[PDB]
Amino acid sequence: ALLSFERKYRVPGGTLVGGNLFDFWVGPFYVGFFGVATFFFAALGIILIAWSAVLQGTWNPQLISVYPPALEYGLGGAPLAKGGLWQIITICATGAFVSWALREVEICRKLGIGYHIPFAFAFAILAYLTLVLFRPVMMGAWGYAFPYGIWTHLDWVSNTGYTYGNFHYNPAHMIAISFFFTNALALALHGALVLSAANPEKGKEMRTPDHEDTFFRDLVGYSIGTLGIHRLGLLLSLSAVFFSALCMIITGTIWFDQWVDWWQWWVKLPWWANIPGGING
Amino acid sequence: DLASLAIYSFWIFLAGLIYYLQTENMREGYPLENEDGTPAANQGPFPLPKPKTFILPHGRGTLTVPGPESEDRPIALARTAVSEGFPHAPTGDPMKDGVGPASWVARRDLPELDGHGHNKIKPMKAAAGFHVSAGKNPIGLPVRGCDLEIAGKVVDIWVDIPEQMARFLEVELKDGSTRLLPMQMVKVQSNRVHVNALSSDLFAGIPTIKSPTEVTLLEEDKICGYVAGGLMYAAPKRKSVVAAMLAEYA
Amino acid sequence: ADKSDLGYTGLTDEQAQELHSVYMSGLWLFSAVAIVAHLAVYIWRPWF
Amino acid sequence: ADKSDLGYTGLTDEQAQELHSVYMSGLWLFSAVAIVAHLAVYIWRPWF
């Protein structure tokens, strides 16, 4: 199936060196060179919810668990359901993260829409990596990792997330939250910055980008335009992750101690050194 | 209320919100049409809605949307696979019949209007707002195409007000017959420009803007689409292009 | 050769010596021949 | 240039030399290779 204007856009290529051997449009979906790759990755991956459903216990993805290896086995493998079989799921996950963000280029080079999209999933490629590769290779073994589940890695983040006291004292974490609540801060007015002009209240003539400049300059004193808030969505939604992968690339591997004990490096200053002031005083 | 109540006014009132939302994103484009002009396979589980009345910003008519969807504009792809699926290929050269990577559309002859009573995009010789009167000022320098050779000379800027921005970079030919080219692809460093899209002997194939000051919404389709035409094919196959089109960083 | 209108394609006999000659391979090797696998099934083992 | 009739492309004579030598040979070079290999698969090890 294809759209009405999807007539002129149909042209073979996009893929690199080898030919148009893999680029057949199966339905509404694109099966380029990384299309059948993800077909190979998505077919094996549904079984990885069902494998440790006979080794760890339950058959329902409520408590299904293929645990990460232990902490100290070294630079190597593991048991199985408790690491070994866990060690196989990732290169599919990530091998499928990759075969997706780069099958887009077989459409990007196919037409001529920009290459800033093999990229906004690469802050998701550099956000799931920081929990599977970036951490547990150095402190001992692959045992420093989370479980894949949907209720297993839940009681892994809270009642097992106060190893560093409270994680709010974690400054970049809290800056990578000074970056996150600001994502829907600028989707809430921009997802409503194109809605109510052809549908004003009912009947009225449509607005142009000069009413935008009498509504938002009549809002919050800053009107960078309409191309300043798509440079104000891709500024809300990619970086709360490098300020979290930096809230953790120096947390646990260097600071497996209380980050509530980090906020006593601030009160130590020669000026007010030997001085208890307020609350502290 | 209770411990088991409120999660049900939700598994229902919102279990059709991917349903109600999808159709509202499936206005334009649909219905689905085949590879010729034919009531196609179908639409989907979220079929297209029958549109409501659309009032336009400068009295451009009763253009309901989804609107015109048929085969008005010329298309030229020689159907390789008569079966629906396998792609199609242009007749002669793909940058003359306008098929593949270079796209456009036929619209009405009323350009984009703002609210002052005037058009949207004008050159610097159509708005004496900001000028040149201090030091030495760069609005007039030579360029280079993707063939790695000089292409022309750009000496002007199409100004903007509401966005205070820019949309085109006008090229003074040897003659004067107008040409155009987009804005974001560009990659200028020092004293000469480099574009990596079109070769320097395929710039006249870019339509002369009917007016050197006006861009009608009809014209603003190929004029920012021919460069996309050269982002797919270019360029088979051997030697310099391999050290030009591939690699790079930005 | 390109087409225009409903409901090509289509069409014929690109539909007659083609579409008739491949679809029944997916509608017999799995319709009545799938009841030939029912052989070692209908008796093994619904009845214990 | 593209042609007309049934069916293209192609390519007579290639209904019994292309769509029967690398198409119907698959109904043999593995379909029967299963039947022989299963004599060393079906009994390992469903019976303990």
Next chain:
Amino acid sequence: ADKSDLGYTGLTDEQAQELHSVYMSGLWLFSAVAIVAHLAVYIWRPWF
């Protein structure tokens, strides 16, 4: 041409024929049939 004022249309008195003879008389099904299911729940069983 375009109509005069609010409401137009309207109109006068298309308001008092197609929206004042069934919008206030037929809409008494919203007033009459409702008490049928309200005289059954007025105090049954707010009074066991």
Next chain:
Amino acid sequence: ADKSDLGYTGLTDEQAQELHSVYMSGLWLFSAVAIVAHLAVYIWRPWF
């Protein structure tokens, strides 16, 4: 046509015939049918 003064619009013909006709037939019911619910509440059953 744009009129100079208030209300126009308006518009007399559509002001006192559109906003006063159902005013003793509009602003005389909501200050009455609401009291029907009131006079059936003050006595039943605030008193213990």
Next chain:
Amino acid sequence: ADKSDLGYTGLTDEQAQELHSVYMSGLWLFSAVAIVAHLAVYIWRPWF
């Protein structure tokens, strides 16, 4: 239609026609009915 600055519209001398024909006639029942409702409050039941 607008004249100039300070201040339209409007309007002289419709300002007294607007905001003293109903802004000092009906808006004084804001102190002829509310002050009538003041009475059930001034000493009932501050002073019992």
Next chain:
Amino acid sequence: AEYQNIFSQVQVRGPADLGMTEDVNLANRSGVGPFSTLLGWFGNAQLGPIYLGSLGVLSLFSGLMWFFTIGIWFWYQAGWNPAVFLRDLFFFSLEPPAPEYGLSFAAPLKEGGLWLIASFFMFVAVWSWWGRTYLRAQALGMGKHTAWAFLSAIWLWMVLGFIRPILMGSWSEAVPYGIFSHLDWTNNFSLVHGNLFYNPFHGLSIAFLYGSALLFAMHGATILAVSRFGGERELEQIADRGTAAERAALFWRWTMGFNATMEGIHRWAIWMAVLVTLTGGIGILLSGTVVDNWYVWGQNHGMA
């Protein structure tokens, strides 16, 4: 001094122009704000104007005494020196009337005093800035959706220290005031209620903040990506469908399996909006008058 014309953006500044005129105002907006022309070749560069009426500065004032009330309870312990203030600009604290006081405002300045003023004024700052986004879309001829994602946003503000701490009846049931005091409070509502993981109303609100970046990681990408063509102008791409609904409307259907209308890409983006603090306001109006310990919720309505 001249404004230059550098290499590859590009830009041209703006003389003396504002916006539109209908139901707004004339002699209220102040002088033409001075322009920040400092490498303003990327986005825009234009300060002013601003609707400085009584529908906006009621929040400048009511926010300021929300800003100064916890302020005169952030210098109270320092030692009356400017050394300890910026030293503990966060270590300082202030809590509302105690978990035993509640419905009476009889509390003096000390134990729990300067909580009763900050919010009281803020009450007509937030609520007087719900309607600086709801009626300035009426000064022209637009809609009201801009503060209907805001009525949903002040739905989470409708439970924290408002509706629950009055029915139940106490001010400790509202949020302490500071910069860390409430961070030692976001984990309070966690553990006292037996952890809110099996509370999929607080957790789906989460689940509606994990769809703000599944919805703006790519919008900020593709609208910047189909902009060489003409997809930056979001005010001429819907009813007169340009080629930006062709490089961005064939791009995603092939990929993930569906695309969207140039108008409908603002219909999901405000549906992962009016559902974040809205499913948060419910999932925090369902926490305190339903089942406190949510571990004793999500095993009887979860596994049992």
Next chain:
Amino acid sequence: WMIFDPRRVFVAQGVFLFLLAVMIHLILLSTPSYNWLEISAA
């Protein structure tokens, strides 16, 4: 001539009757001193 009229009468009429009653209902609905529907037998 500064704000609106037509919008307030069909949609903003609600924030006067409904969202002023439906929230004040469940207050006097939960009160024992009234009950009506919770009268039954007590």
Next chain:
Amino acid sequence: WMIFDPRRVFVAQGVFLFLLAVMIHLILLSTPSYNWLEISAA
């Protein structure tokens, strides 16, 4: 001048009174002794 008149005349009249009234009508009912609607009873 700076302002018009005859439109916000229905919103400074319809709902403006209750903005003051809603924050003041409920500083009195909290007392179990007053109530006037709860005590006129037993």
Next chain:
Amino acid sequence: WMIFDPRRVFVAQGVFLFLLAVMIHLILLSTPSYNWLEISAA
């Protein structure tokens, strides 16, 4: 000019009977010394 003549004394004066007034009302209400409404039986 600028100083809102038919405005600030109509609407901004109609709310400064709430800006100046009610912020000091909710303090001397629950003061035992004055009371005048909270003396009760003792």
Next chain:
Amino acid sequence: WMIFDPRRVFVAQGVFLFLLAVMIHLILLSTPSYNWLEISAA
């Protein structure tokens, strides 16, 4: 009429009954009574 095959019947429709068949061969192996080849040791 319409519809397509030469593309679909080679790499598309084969994963429809494959979406129907192998998704339920697993299940007849989870049950501790059916199984048909699982319970062999005992």
Next chain:
Amino acid sequence: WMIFDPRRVFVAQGVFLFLLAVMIHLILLSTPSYNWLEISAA
């Protein structure tokens, strides 16, 4: 338009009746009395 035909029955309808079948089974296969599969011995 509105409702076409020759694509739904091939890859969608085969998994619509199946989708209408699946959310029915795992309750009647697991009701306090019914089941009709595992139990055949006793």
Next chain:
Amino acid sequence: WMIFDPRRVFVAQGVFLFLLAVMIHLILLSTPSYNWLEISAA
């Protein structure tokens, strides 16, 4: 007719069966009670 012969008839069977055989092995390895190397570990 159509489809492919010099393109997609030797590759719609290579990684296609690898997408249906070698990843089907992982089901008969999701066992550790059968298994052709995990029989001893029971």
Next chain:
Amino acid sequence: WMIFDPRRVFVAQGVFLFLLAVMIHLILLSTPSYNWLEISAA
């Protein structure tokens, strides 16, 4: 060339044997009861 020799099997089969090499290195080098080089301490 029917199959593609210097494409599908010169750097795409060298990782096709690399396909079935190291994924099993995390099953057979794994297993909770084998090792035979790691436990040189217990």
